[PDB]
Amino acid sequence: LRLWALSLAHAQLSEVLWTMVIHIGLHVRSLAGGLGLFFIFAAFATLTV
């Protein structure tokens, strides 16, 4: 069952990373939407690598 465990852990850690980084980056105004996406996405890239 440890293979299952590793797969489960991978799925849930990826999901929580998504909800922590990408989901919080959601706002109506494009002035910050088109700008802060830079640093939030760089953070996503660094965290996943």
Binding site: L26, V28, G33, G34, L35, L37, A45
Partner: protein
């Protein structure tokens, strides 16, 4: 010369992966009207009337991706220009 390829290859690959990711994401927000299967969260509280305002908000959400995509094009351009210096 300044800003050699050793400190800019990472920038180039990051900008390439970022532009492809952002363009695909914006395509998903626009064409699919941001179905919950791809994007649950939204930014509003009152839906008294119907789905038209939800569709419009998803349209401007999809619009917001283009600015960052073009920014990544610009970053890749700067990185490649710095690499061209030797």
């Amino acid at each position: 010369l300044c800003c050699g390829p050793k400190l800019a290859a990472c920038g180039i690959v990051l900008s390439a992966w970022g532009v492809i990711m952002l363009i695909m994401l914006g395509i998903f927000f626009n064409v699919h009207s941001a179905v919950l299967i791809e994007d649950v969260p939204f930014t509003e509280k009152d839906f008294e009337n119907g789905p038209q305002n939800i569709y419009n908000l998803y349209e401007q959400v999809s619009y917001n991706c283009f600015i960052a995509a073009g920014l990544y094009l610009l970053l890749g351009g700067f990185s490649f220009c710095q690499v061209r210096l030797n």
